[PDB]
Protein backbone atom coordinates (compact mmCIF):
# COMPACT_ATOMS: atom_id res chain seq x y z
CA UNK A 1 0.00 0.00 0.00
CA UNK A 2 1.40 3.48 -0.98
CA UNK A 3 0.60 5.40 2.26
CA UNK A 4 1.50 2.35 4.37
CA UNK A 5 4.84 1.99 2.74
CA UNK A 6 5.73 5.63 2.71
CA UNK A 7 5.20 6.11 6.44
CA UNK A 8 6.45 2.67 7.52
CA UNK A 9 3.04 1.96 9.01
CA UNK A 10 2.86 -1.02 11.38
CA UNK A 11 -0.38 -2.43 12.82
CA UNK A 12 -0.16 -4.83 15.78
CA UNK A 13 -3.52 -6.48 16.78
CA UNK A 14 -7.11 -6.39 15.52
CA UNK A 15 -9.69 -5.09 17.94
CA UNK A 16 -11.92 -1.94 17.52
CA UNK A 17 -10.06 -0.39 20.52
CA UNK A 18 -7.14 1.33 18.76
CA UNK A 19 -4.14 3.44 19.82
CA UNK A 20 -2.11 5.40 17.24
CA UNK A 21 1.30 6.69 18.23
CA UNK A 22 3.08 9.62 16.59
CA UNK A 23 6.70 10.56 17.13
CA UNK A 24 8.62 13.77 17.45
CA UNK A 25 11.42 15.56 15.59
CA UNK A 26 14.66 13.64 15.19
CA UNK A 27 13.31 10.24 16.11
CA UNK A 28 11.02 7.62 14.62
CA UNK A 29 8.41 5.10 15.73
CA UNK A 30 11.17 3.25 17.67
CA UNK A 31 10.80 5.93 20.33
CA UNK A 32 7.77 3.92 21.48
CA UNK A 33 9.64 0.71 22.06
CA UNK A 34 9.12 0.62 25.83
CA UNK A 35 5.45 1.57 25.68
CA UNK A 36 4.13 -0.70 22.91
CA UNK A 37 4.71 -3.96 24.89
CA UNK A 38 2.20 -2.84 27.44
CA UNK A 39 -0.48 -1.83 24.90
CA UNK A 40 -0.67 -4.77 22.53
CA UNK A 41 -2.73 -7.13 24.67
CA UNK A 42 -5.50 -4.58 25.09
CA UNK A 43 -5.41 -2.50 21.93
CA UNK A 44 -4.79 -2.58 18.26
CA UNK A 45 -1.57 -0.50 18.04
CA UNK A 46 -0.63 1.62 15.03
CA UNK A 47 2.90 3.02 14.57
CA UNK A 48 3.99 5.30 11.76
CA UNK A 49 6.86 7.62 10.81
CA UNK A 50 6.48 11.28 9.92
CA UNK A 51 7.46 12.32 6.47
CA UNK A 52 11.04 13.62 6.66
CA UNK A 53 12.16 11.18 9.34
CA UNK A 54 15.41 9.46 8.22
CA UNK A 55 13.50 6.18 7.78
CA UNK A 56 11.39 7.81 5.04
CA UNK A 57 12.21 8.49 1.38
CA UNK A 58 13.53 12.06 0.99
CA UNK A 59 11.90 12.17 -2.48
CA UNK A 60 8.54 12.25 -0.79
CA UNK A 61 9.43 15.27 1.37
CA UNK A 62 7.52 18.14 -0.28
CA UNK A 63 8.77 21.38 1.27
CA UNK A 64 5.53 23.25 0.47
CA UNK A 65 3.30 20.52 1.93
CA UNK A 66 5.30 20.51 5.17
CA UNK A 67 5.73 24.27 5.43
CA UNK A 68 3.08 24.18 8.08
CA UNK A 69 2.08 21.54 10.57
CA UNK A 70 -1.21 21.07 8.63
CA UNK A 71 0.64 18.92 6.11
CA UNK A 72 1.56 16.40 8.75
CA UNK A 73 -2.04 16.47 10.10
CA UNK A 74 -3.33 15.55 6.60
CA UNK A 75 -0.86 12.64 6.56
CA UNK A 76 -2.20 11.43 9.91
CA UNK A 77 -5.80 11.59 8.75
CA UNK A 78 -4.77 9.76 5.55
CA UNK A 79 -3.16 6.95 7.52
CA UNK A 80 -6.31 6.60 9.69
CA UNK A 81 -8.53 6.55 6.59
CA UNK A 82 -6.30 4.07 4.74
CA UNK A 83 -6.55 1.71 7.74
CA UNK A 84 -10.33 2.29 8.04
CA UNK A 85 -9.96 3.40 11.63
CA UNK A 86 -13.11 5.09 12.88
CA UNK A 87 -11.83 6.09 16.29
CA UNK A 88 -8.56 5.99 18.16
CA UNK A 89 -6.66 7.21 21.21
CA UNK A 90 -3.83 9.26 19.73
CA UNK A 91 -0.57 9.53 21.64
CA UNK A 92 1.56 12.33 20.30
CA UNK A 93 5.20 12.97 21.17
CA UNK A 94 6.56 16.49 20.82
CA UNK A 95 5.48 18.01 17.47
CA UNK A 96 3.05 15.06 16.98
CA UNK A 97 0.99 16.36 19.88
CA UNK A 98 0.21 19.49 17.86
CA UNK A 99 -0.17 17.51 14.69
CA UNK A 100 -2.82 15.41 16.44
CA UNK A 101 -4.54 18.52 17.79
CA UNK A 102 -4.71 19.98 14.26
CA UNK A 103 -6.03 16.73 12.85
CA UNK A 104 -8.67 16.70 15.61
CA UNK A 105 -9.94 20.12 14.57
CA UNK A 106 -10.68 18.85 11.07
CA UNK A 107 -11.83 15.34 12.10
CA UNK A 108 -12.77 15.25 15.77
CA UNK A 109 -14.75 12.14 15.08
CA UNK A 110 -11.58 10.16 14.58
CA UNK A 111 -10.22 10.79 18.07
CA UNK A 112 -11.53 9.82 21.45
CA UNK A 113 -8.56 11.27 23.41
CA UNK A 114 -5.19 12.79 22.77
CA UNK A 115 -2.34 12.00 25.12
CA UNK A 116 0.54 14.46 24.68
CA UNK A 117 4.13 13.87 25.71
CA UNK A 118 6.57 16.82 25.63
CA UNK A 119 4.09 19.12 23.78
CA UNK A 120 4.27 22.83 23.14
CA UNK A 121 2.08 25.19 21.15
CA UNK A 122 4.83 27.85 20.87
CA UNK A 123 8.57 27.73 21.59
CA UNK A 124 9.34 31.43 21.14
CA UNK A 125 8.99 33.81 24.05
CA UNK A 126 7.13 37.09 23.99
CA UNK A 127 6.58 39.65 26.71
CA UNK A 128 3.48 37.77 27.86
CA UNK A 129 4.39 34.12 27.05
CA UNK A 130 7.27 31.76 28.10
CA UNK A 131 8.02 29.09 25.56
CA UNK A 132 11.67 28.51 26.32
CA UNK A 133 13.51 30.23 23.54
CA UNK A 134 14.30 33.65 22.27
CA UNK A 135 14.38 34.08 18.52
CA UNK A 136 18.15 34.71 18.63
CA UNK A 137 18.68 31.37 20.40
CA UNK A 138 16.72 29.67 17.54
CA UNK A 139 18.86 31.63 15.01
CA UNK A 140 22.04 30.13 16.51
CA UNK A 141 20.56 26.63 16.38
CA UNK A 142 19.71 26.84 12.69
CA UNK A 143 23.19 28.13 11.86
CA UNK A 144 24.77 25.18 13.70
CA UNK A 145 22.51 22.74 11.77
CA UNK A 146 23.61 24.37 8.48
CA UNK A 147 27.30 24.63 9.24
CA UNK A 148 28.08 21.04 10.26
CA UNK A 149 25.28 18.60 10.74
CA UNK A 150 27.12 15.59 12.32
CA UNK A 151 28.74 17.77 14.95
CA UNK A 152 25.36 19.48 15.66
CA UNK A 153 23.69 16.06 16.10
CA UNK A 154 26.40 14.90 18.49
CA UNK A 155 26.10 18.03 20.60
CA UNK A 156 22.32 18.31 20.56
CA UNK A 157 21.36 14.70 21.28
CA UNK A 158 22.65 14.68 24.89
CA UNK A 159 20.92 17.94 25.61
CA UNK A 160 17.59 16.82 24.16
CA UNK A 161 17.61 13.38 25.77
CA UNK A 162 19.07 14.43 29.13
CA UNK A 163 20.50 12.04 31.65
CA UNK A 164 23.90 10.54 31.27
CA UNK A 165 25.64 11.85 28.13
CA UNK A 166 26.74 8.46 26.89
CA UNK A 167 23.53 6.52 27.58
CA UNK A 168 22.10 4.16 25.02
CA UNK A 169 19.16 6.60 24.52
CA UNK A 170 21.56 9.43 23.73
CA UNK A 171 23.32 7.16 21.23
CA UNK A 172 20.01 6.12 19.65
CA UNK A 173 18.75 9.68 19.28
CA UNK A 174 22.09 10.83 17.84
CA UNK A 175 21.73 8.02 15.24
CA UNK A 176 18.13 8.94 14.28
CA UNK A 177 18.93 12.65 14.15
CA UNK A 178 21.83 12.03 11.82
CA UNK A 179 19.68 9.69 9.68
CA UNK A 180 17.76 12.78 8.48
CA UNK A 181 18.89 14.47 5.34
CA UNK A 182 20.48 17.74 6.55
CA UNK A 183 18.37 20.06 4.44
CA UNK A 184 15.22 18.36 5.68
CA UNK A 185 16.35 18.49 9.30
CA UNK A 186 17.01 22.21 8.96
CA UNK A 187 13.71 23.00 7.25
CA UNK A 188 11.59 20.94 9.65
CA UNK A 189 13.46 22.26 12.73
CA UNK A 190 12.67 25.83 11.53
CA UNK A 191 9.00 24.98 10.78
CA UNK A 192 8.57 23.49 14.26
CA UNK A 193 10.45 26.11 16.17
CA UNK A 194 8.62 28.91 14.44
CA UNK A 195 5.17 27.35 14.81
CA UNK A 196 2.30 28.89 16.70
CA UNK A 197 -0.68 26.80 17.74
CA UNK A 198 -1.79 29.01 20.65
CA UNK A 199 -4.62 30.68 18.78
CA UNK A 200 -6.40 27.45 17.89
CA UNK A 201 -6.30 25.83 21.33
CA UNK A 202 -9.73 27.19 22.31
CA UNK A 203 -11.29 25.26 19.43
CA UNK A 204 -10.08 21.85 20.49
CA UNK A 205 -12.91 19.56 21.53
CA UNK A 206 -11.23 16.14 21.99
CA UNK A 207 -10.07 15.58 25.61
CA UNK A 208 -6.35 15.97 26.15
CA UNK A 209 -3.90 14.54 28.67
CA UNK A 210 -0.78 16.74 28.94
CA UNK A 211 2.35 14.92 30.13
CA UNK A 212 5.96 16.17 30.29
CA UNK A 213 9.21 15.70 32.07
CA UNK A 214 9.85 18.27 34.80
CA UNK A 215 13.24 18.90 33.12
CA UNK A 216 12.76 19.25 29.34
CA UNK A 217 15.12 21.30 27.18
CA UNK A 218 12.30 22.51 24.92
CA UNK A 219 9.25 22.58 27.20
CA UNK A 220 9.23 24.76 30.32
CA UNK A 221 6.71 23.42 32.88
CA UNK A 222 4.61 26.54 32.48
CA UNK A 223 3.79 25.37 28.91
CA UNK A 224 1.83 22.47 30.33
CA UNK A 225 -0.13 24.93 32.50
CA UNK A 226 -0.66 27.13 29.45
CA UNK A 227 -2.07 24.22 27.43
CA UNK A 228 -4.36 23.29 30.29
CA UNK A 229 -5.64 26.85 30.77
CA UNK A 230 -6.26 27.60 27.10
CA UNK A 231 -7.42 24.30 25.53
CA UNK A 232 -11.14 24.34 24.94
CA UNK A 233 -11.54 20.68 25.73
CA UNK A 234 -11.47 18.84 29.03
CA UNK A 235 -7.82 18.34 29.96
CA UNK A 236 -5.52 17.13 32.72
CA UNK A 237 -1.82 17.74 33.34
CA UNK A 238 0.77 15.46 34.91
CA UNK A 239 4.38 16.57 35.20
CA UNK A 240 6.64 13.55 35.56
CA UNK A 241 9.74 13.45 37.85
CA UNK A 242 11.91 12.65 34.85
CA UNK A 243 14.58 14.31 32.69
CA UNK A 244 14.39 14.59 28.95
CA UNK A 245 12.40 15.43 25.89
CA UNK A 246 12.03 11.70 24.90
CA UNK A 247 11.43 10.36 28.39
CA UNK A 248 9.43 7.35 27.19
CA UNK A 249 12.67 6.17 25.56
CA UNK A 250 15.26 7.28 28.09
CA UNK A 251 13.47 6.93 31.43
CA UNK A 252 10.83 4.25 30.92
CA UNK A 253 10.69 2.93 34.45
CA UNK A 254 9.36 6.31 35.72
CA UNK A 255 7.51 7.46 32.61
CA UNK A 256 5.74 4.41 31.09
CA UNK A 257 3.44 3.88 34.16
CA UNK A 258 2.29 7.50 33.89
CA UNK A 259 1.56 7.27 30.16
CA UNK A 260 -0.30 4.05 30.68
CA UNK A 261 -2.50 5.46 33.38
CA UNK A 262 -3.51 8.33 31.13
CA UNK A 263 -4.18 6.03 28.15
CA UNK A 264 -6.23 3.54 30.20
CA UNK A 265 -8.23 6.07 32.33
CA UNK A 266 -10.55 8.83 31.20
CA UNK A 267 -10.76 12.33 32.75
Author numbering: 2 to 268
Original authors' sentences:
Recombinant proteins of KAI2 and KAI2ply2, purified from E. coli, were crystallized. Comparison of KAI2 and KAI2ply2 showed that there was little structural difference (r.m.s.d., 0.2 Å) in overall structure. However, in detail, we found that the residue A219 of KAI2 was bound to aromatic residues as Y124 and F134 of the lid domain by hydrophobic interactions, while the residue V219 of KAI2ply2 was bound to extended aromatic residues as Y124, F134, F157, F194, and H246 of the lid domain. The entrance of KAI2 presents an opened pocket and hydrophobic charge for the ligand, whereas the entrance of KAI2ply2 forms a closed pocket due to C-gamma 1 and C-gamma 2 of V219, which is a bulkier residue than alanine. The results showed that the amino acid residues of KAI2 ranging from 125–150 exhibited a higher B-factor than those of KAI2ply2, implying that this region, corresponding to the helical ‘lid’ domain, might be more rigid with lower motional amplitude in the KAI2ply2 protein. We found that the Tm of the KAI2ply2 protein was increased compared to that of the wild-type KAI2 under CD assay conditions; the Tm values of KAI2 and KAI2ply2 were calculated to be 45.23 °C and 49.36 °C, respectively. Thus, the Ala219 of KAI2 appears to be important in forming space for entry of the ligand as well as maintaining flexibility of the lid domain.
